[model samples]
Target: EVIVYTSNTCPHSFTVKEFLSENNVEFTEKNIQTDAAARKELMKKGIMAVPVIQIDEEVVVGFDRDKIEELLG
Candidate 1:
């Protein structure tokens, strides 16, 4: 399963989300603004930004299309 830490108005977040959608990738989205536990969890990972993607044990801290594609592939 794929997990993505996101923010409501983060442009990059939705871009990756839409990209995932186009690629038929299933993802779990966590909104930092709305989910406090999610924020705390992200802080533990030392992530201070949006669009943090998690695939298994890999963490990609941005909208990385090529990386995502490679992993999904």
Candidate 2:
């Protein structure tokens, strides 16, 4: 499962979405700014930030292009 934690006005969040779409990777987005549950979920992970990408059980902070690509495999 691919899950992305994002916010409404974050640039990296948009970039991550664009990158994933370009690569044809289907993913779920959790917008913390809009969804209360998403905010709680992110807090549980100890990440008080947006644009976090979760590929399966592993998480990648920010839009690490190479890391995201590698984890997609």
Candidate 3:
């Protein structure tokens, strides 16, 4: 499962979502602004960034397009 941690108000998060949509990549979005449980879990994974991308067991700190593409591809 691809989990994307994002804040709705964040522009970078929006960009990442847009990119994923454009590329036809399916991902589960977790809004940090509302989901406390997910936020705590993400923090435990050592992700401090607003737009974190998690692909399987790997955790990405931000919206790294190249990295995301590599993992998805």
Candidate 4:
């Protein structure tokens, strides 16, 4: 399973969504802008960035196709 942390106004979030959809990957999208709980979790992680992709316990701070595929496999 994969969990993607993103924001509504973040362009990277859109790209990340398309990437996941095209790759036929299913994920839970956590929109920090609207979800206060998600926002709290985001801050708790000390991640000051959007698109925090989590695969299992591994985390990738940005969108990268190769890394994402590698982890998926």
Candidate 5:
């Protein structure tokens, strides 16, 4: 499963989400701004930035289309 940790107000987060949706990629979104537990969980995983994405066991710190595409492909 693809999991994305993002803040609702972050543009980068929104862009990544839009790209995923446009590409028909199935993913679960965790909004860190309103969900404190989710935020803490990602923090524990060493993700301290907004728009962190996890594809299976691989973790990405920010929105990188090439990397994400490589992983998904």
Candidate 6:
């Protein structure tokens, strides 16, 4: 399973989710904008930004296409 921590107003967040949707990838989106607990969850992982993608145990802190693709495999 893949998890994506996102914020409503972040362009990178939208793009990442868009990319995933376009590829027909399944993912869970945790929106930090409307969910306080989601923000805390990300903070616990030392992530202060949105668009964090987690594939199993590996975490991608931004919208890195190559890294995301590598992990998806």
TM-score of each: 0.75, 0.75, 0.70, 0.74, 0.73, 0.75
Report the lDDT tens digits of candidate 1 across residue range 1-65: 99998867745346777888888888899988898888898899988987899988999987777
Residue 37 lDDT, candidate 4, scale 0-100: 82
For residues 1-73, what per-residue lDDT tens digits would candidate 6 score against the true structure? 9999886764533588889999999888899989878889898998899789987888889878898887766
Q: Write the per-residue lDDT of candidate 4 for residues 21-71, one digit (tens) a residue.
A: 887888898999998788988888899788899977888897776888888
RMSD (CA, angstroms), candidate 2: 11.5
Clashes of 3: 0
Worst 10 residues of 3 by lDDT: 6-15
Cand. 3 TM to true fold = 0.70
Full-model lDDT, candidate 1: 0.85
lDDT of 5 at 65: 79
Off by over 4 Å in 4: 1-14
What lDDT is obtained when candidate 3 is compared to the true structure?
A: 0.79
Q: Model 3 over residues 28-58: C-alpha lDDT tens digits?
A: 8888779777778777877767788777788
Clashes of each: 0, 0, 0, 0, 0, 0
Badly placed stretches (over 4 Å) of model 1 are 1-14
How well is each residue in 1-73 modelled by candidate 5, as lDDT tens digits?
A: 9999877674533678898899999888899989778788887987678788887788888878799888877
Local error of candidate 5 at residue 52 (angstroms)? 0.7
Collision pairs in model 6 = none
Name the lDDT of candidate 6.
0.85
Taken over the whole model, the C-alpha lDDT of each candidate is 0.85, 0.84, 0.79, 0.83, 0.83, 0.85
